C-alpha cells in the first residue's frame, strides 16, 4: 500500500507516557514523554515509519465485556481498526493473544503488594489472612483479570473478598490507587503491576514501597491487530532494542536515574 | 494432515531434561526427567499430541556458522525439516526469531556471574578491570553470540579478552563450565545464563554462587519452523500455564525445593 | 441442536450458593457466590458451554408428592424440562437415581447431630432414648425421607416420634434449623447434612457443633434429566476436577480458610 | 436374550475376598469369602441373577500400558469381553470412566500413610521433605497412577523420588507392602487406600498405623462393560443396601467386629 502515519493508541501512564509541563503549548507527538515515548521513536526509526501518538479514548488497558463481548481501551482501539500499533505498558495475556498479536517482551514484571511504609504487611499471604487492612487492584485491565480468574488458592481468597469489599476497594488509575495508599493511614494496600510500583517508590514523599515477592511473572509487548504485517517488523525491533542495551538504558532513565528516595 | 507424532528436539541441559538415574532400564520418553520434560507433558496434554524426545545430535543449542551459513543444534533441527518443536532452555534471540519461531517467553533469564566461593569478583565490571581470574562462556550458544556482537562498551572489552585468552576459556557444556570454575582455585569464573547459575547454587558441594546483577533479559521460548502452525497453540499454551501458576511450581520443584544449601 | 446456554437449576444453602451482600446492584450469574457458584464455572470451563443459574422457584430439593405423584424443587427443574443440569448439594438416592441421573459424587456427606454447646448429647441413640430434648430434620429433602423410610430400629423410632412431635419439629431451611438450635437453650437439636454441620460450627457465635458419627454416608452429584447426553461430559468433568484437587481446595476455601471459630 | 451366568471378576485382596481356610475343599463361589463375596451375594439377590466368582488371572486390578494401549486386570476382563462384571474395591477415576461403567460408589478411601509404629512421620510433607524413610505404593493400579498424573506439589514431588528410587519402592499386593512396612525397622513407609489401611491396624501383630490424613478422597464402584444394560440394576442396588444400611454392616463386620488390636 501507500505510504501512510501509523496510529499508535497508548495510555498515560507514569513514566510511561506523561504529559510535558508545558504541554499546553505544543503539537502533536511533542506534548508527551516518557519510557514508551522514547521506545515509540526508536521502533519508527528502525522500521522505516512516521506515527501519531493518540491517548486511547476511555482511558482503559482493554477488556472484554462480558456480556455485548466488546473490547475497550487499547485492545478495543486495535481489534475495532482504530489504531495500527499499541505502544504502551500493555499486558501479554492469554485472552488477549487469542485477539491481537503481540511482540517479546519489551519489560518483564510481575503483580505486586505497595503499602504506606510501615503497614505490618509483607506478604500475599499475610493480606489474604488478616482483615484489618483493606486492598485492591486497578479497576479493570489485567491484574484485575488475574485475580477473578485465579484458582490458586491464596489469589482466588483475594479475589473473593475484593469483589465483595465495601467501600470499593478498586481504582480508576495507578495514581488513584497510590493516592489512595498515602492517604489512608496504613489501613489500603494496592495490588499493582511491580514496574509501577518500583516507579512509585523512587518519587516523592517517599512513603510507599514494595514488599514481598511477586505473585506471577509476566511482561509488557507492543501489540498489533492480529495478522498485521506490521507485527513482524516491530517484534525484531523489540528484539534488537533489547540486544543493544537500549531498554535497559530507558529503564535506568525514567525510573532510577533521578530517583528521590536515596539510592543502592 | 494425519495424525503424527511431534518429533520433540531437547538437549541435556541440568535441570530442565536429564537422564533418570535407570535411564538404561527404560525406553523413550521415560528415559527423561526435568523442568522441560515436565512441561512437554503439559504442553502436549493442552495441544492435544502424541510426542518423542529426542536429545539433539550434535549437543548444541544453535549456531549459524559464518562460512557455509549452516545452522546446528537445536535450531538446526527445526530449519531443516527434522524436528516438529524445540522444548528446552533455548534463548529467544534476534538472529533466531529471523528463522524459527518462539512462544512467549515460558521462563526469563540473563546472562551471570559464577564465582566459586571467595573469589573477589562482584560484578561485571570487577572482572572486565582485573587480570588475576580468567573468564569464559559456553563456546556456542547465544551467551558466547551476545559478547561476540555487543558494542556495550564493558561487555565489548569483555569479548575482546574471552576470544583471545590462553588456554581457552570457553567450555563445551554447563557441566564443565562448573567444574572449571569448582578445580580452578578462585582463578576462573564463567559467565552462564542465570537460571543455571542459580541452580547450580542450589546444588552441593555448595561451593558456587552467583554474583552481581545480571548482564541481560532475556527470556526461553518453545520454537518451531518458521510459520508453522503449531506455533499458535503451544504459544497459547505455554501463556495458559504460565496463568495457572504451573510454571511458577515446576521452577521451584527443580530449582528450590529440594535445594542442598540452605533455606531462605 | 444449536448452540444454547444451559440452564442450572440450584438453591440458596450456604455456603454452596449465597447472595453477594451487594447482590441487588449486580446481574445474571455475578449476584451469587460459594462453593457450588465456584464448581459450577468449573464445569462449564471443561465441557465448554455458556449457563445461567437460577435459584429453584419453590426453594425446595426435590420429593414426589404421594397422591399427585409431581416431583418438585430442583428435582422437578430437571424431570419437567425447566432445567438442564442442577449444581446444588443434591443428595444421590434410589428414588431419585430413578427419575433423573447423576455424576459421581463432588462431595461426601451423611447425617448427622447439631446442637448447641453443652446439650447432654452425643449420639443418635442418646437422642432416641431421652424425651427432654426434642429434635427434627430439614422439611423436605433427603434426610427427612431417609428416615421416613428406614428400618434401621434406631432411626426407625426416631421417625416416629419426629412425624408427630408437637410443635412442629422440621423446619424450611436449614438457616432456620440453625437458628432454632441457637434459641431453644439446648432443647431442640438438629438432624442435618455433615456438610452443613461442619460449616455452621465454623461460623460465629460458635455456638452449635456436630457430635457423634454421621448416622448414614452418601454423596451430592451433579444432576441431569434422565438419559441427557450432558451427563458425560458433566461427569467426567466431575472426576476431573476432583482428582486434580480442585474440588478439595474449594472445599478448604468456603469451610475452613475463614472460619470464625478458631484452628486445629 | 436367554438366562446366562453373571461372569464376576475380582481380586484376591483382604478382607474384601479372601480364599477361606479350608477352600480346597471346596468348589465354585464357596472357595471365597470377605466384603465383596457378600456384596456380590446382596447384588445378585437383588438384581435376579446366578453368578460365577472368577479372580482375575493376571492379579491386577488395571492399567492401560502405554506402548500397546491394552488394558490388564480386571478393567481389561471387562473391556475385552472375559467378565460381565467386577464386583472388587476398583476404584472409580477419569481414565476408567472412559472405558467402562462403574455404579454410584459402594465404599469411600484415600490414599493414605501406613507406618510402623513409632516411625517419626504425621503427614505426606513430612514423608516428602525428609530423606531417611523410603516410601512407595502398589505397582500398578489407581495409586501409582494418581502419583504419576499428579500436578499438587507434595504430590509431584513424591512420585518424581518413587519412580527413581533404589531399590525399588513399589510392590505387588498390598500384603507385600504391609510385610516391607512390618520388616523394615522404620525405614519404610506405605502408600495404600485407607480401607485397606484401615483393616490392617486392625490386625495382629498390631505393629501398624495410619497417620495424617487422607491425600485425595475417591470411590469404590461396582463396574460394568461400558453400555451395558446390567449397570442400571446394579446401581440401583447399591444405592439400595446403601440406605437400608447393609454396606455399613458388612464395613464393620469384615473391619472392625473381630478387630485384634483393641476397641474404642
Ligand atoms: N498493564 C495492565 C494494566 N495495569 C496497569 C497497572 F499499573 C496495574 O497495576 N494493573 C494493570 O492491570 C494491562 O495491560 O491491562
Ligand atoms: N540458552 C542458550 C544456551 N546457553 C546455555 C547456558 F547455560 C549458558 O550459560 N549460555 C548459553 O548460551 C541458547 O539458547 O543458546
Ligand atoms: N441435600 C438434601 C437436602 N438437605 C439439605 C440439608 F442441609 C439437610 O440437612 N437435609 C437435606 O435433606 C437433598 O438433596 O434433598
Ligand atoms: N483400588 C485400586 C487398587 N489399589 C489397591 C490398594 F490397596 C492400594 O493401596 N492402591 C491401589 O491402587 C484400583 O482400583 O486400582
Ligand atoms: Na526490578
Ligand atoms: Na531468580
Ligand atoms: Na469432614
Ligand atoms: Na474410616
Same mark, same amino acid.
Given at each position: 500500500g501507500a505510504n501512510k502515519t501509523?496510529?499508535?493508541?497508548?495510555?498515560?501512564?507514569?513514566?510511561?507516557?506523561?504529559?510535558?509541563?508545558?504541554?499546553?503549548?505544543?503539537?502533536?507527538?511533542?506534548?508527551?514523554?516518557?519510557?514508551?515515548?522514547?521506545?515509540?521513536?526508536?521502533?519508527?526509526?528502525?522500521?522505516?515509519?512516521?506515527?501519531?501518538?493518540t491517548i486511547v479514548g476511555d482511558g482503559k488497558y482493554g477488556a472484554r465485556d462480558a456480556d455485548t463481548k466488546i473490547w475497550n481501551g487499547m485492545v478495543g482501539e486495535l481489534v475495532y481498526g482504530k489504531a495500527d500499533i499499541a505502544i504502551a505498558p500493555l499486558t501479554i495475556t492469554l485472552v488477549r493473544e487469542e485477539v491481537i498479536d503481540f511482540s517479546k517482551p519489551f519489560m518483564s514484571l510481575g503483580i505486586s503488594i505497595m503499602?504506606?511504609?510501615?503497614?505490618?504487611?509483607?506478604?500475599?499471604?499475610?493480606?489474604?489472612?488478616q482483615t484489618e487492612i483493606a486492598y485492591g487492584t486497578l479497576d479493570s485491565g489485567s491484574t484485575k483479570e488475574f485475580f477473578r480468574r485465579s484458582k490458586i488458592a491464596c489469589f482466588d481468597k483475594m479475589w473473593t473478598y475484593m469483589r465483595s469489599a465495601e467501600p470499593s476497594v478498586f481504582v480508576r488509575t495507578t495514581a488513584?490507587?497510590?493516592?489512595?495508599?498515602?492517604?489512608? &493511614?496504613?489501613?489500603?494496600?494496592? +495490588? /499493582?503491576?511491580?514496574?509501577? #510500583?518500583?516507579?512509585?517508590?523512587?518519587?516523592?514523599? %517517599?512513603?510507599?514501597?514494595?514488599?514481598?515477592?511477586?505473585?506471577?511473572?509476566?511482561?509488557?509487548?507492543?501489540?498489533?491487530?492480529?495478522?498485521?504485517?506490521?507485527?513482524?517488523?516491530?517484534?525484531?525491533?523489540?528484539? &534488537?532494542?533489547?540486544?543493544?542495551? +537500549? /531498554?535497559?538504558?530507558?529503564? #535506568?532513565?525514567?525510573?532510577?536515574?533521578?530517583?528521590? %528516595?536515596?539510592?543502592?
Amino acid at each position: 500500500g501507500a505510504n501512510k502515519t501509523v496510529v499508535v493508541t497508548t495510555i498515560l501512564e507514569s513514566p510511561y507516557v506523561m504529559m510535558k509541563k508545558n504541554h499546553e503549548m505544543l503539537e502533536g507527538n511533542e506534548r508527551y514523554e516518557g519510557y514508551c515515548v522514547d521506545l515509540a521513536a526508536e521502533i519508527a526509526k528502525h522500521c522505516g515509519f512516521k506515527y501519531k501518538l493518540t491517548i486511547v479514548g476511555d482511558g482503559k488497558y482493554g477488556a472484554r465485556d462480558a456480556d455485548t463481548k466488546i473490547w475497550n481501551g487499547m485492545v478495543g482501539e486495535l481489534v475495532y481498526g482504530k489504531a495500527d500499533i499499541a505502544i504502551a505498558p500493555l499486558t501479554i495475556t492469554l485472552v488477549r493473544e487469542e485477539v491481537i498479536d503481540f511482540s517479546k517482551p519489551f519489560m518483564s514484571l510481575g503483580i505486586s503488594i505497595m503499602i504506606k511504609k510501615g503497614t505490618p504487611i509483607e506478604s500475599a499471604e499475610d493480606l489474604s489472612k488478616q482483615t484489618e487492612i483493606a486492598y485492591g487492584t486497578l479497576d479493570s485491565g489485567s491484574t484485575k483479570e488475574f485475580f477473578r480468574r485465579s484458582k490458586i488458592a491464596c489469589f482466588d481468597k483475594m479475589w473473593t473478598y475484593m469483589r465483595s469489599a465495601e467501600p470499593s476497594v478498586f481504582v480508576r488509575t495507578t495514581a488513584e490507587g497510590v493516592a489512595r495508599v498515602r492517604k489512608s &493511614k496504613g489501613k489500603y494496600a494496592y +495490588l /499493582l503491576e511491580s514496574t509501577m #510500583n518500583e516507579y512509585i517508590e523512587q518519587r516523592k514523599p %517517599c512513603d510507599t514501597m514494595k514488599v514481598g515477592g511477586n505473585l506471577d511473572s509476566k511482561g509488557y509487548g507492543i501489540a498489533t491487530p492480529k495478522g498485521s504485517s506490521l507485527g513482524n517488523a516491530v517484534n525484531l525491533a523489540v528484539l &534488537k532494542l533489547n540486544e543493544q542495551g +537500549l /531498554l535497559d538504558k530507558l529503564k #535506568n532513565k525514567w525510573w532510577y536515574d533521578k530517583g528521590e %528516595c536515596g539510592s543502592g
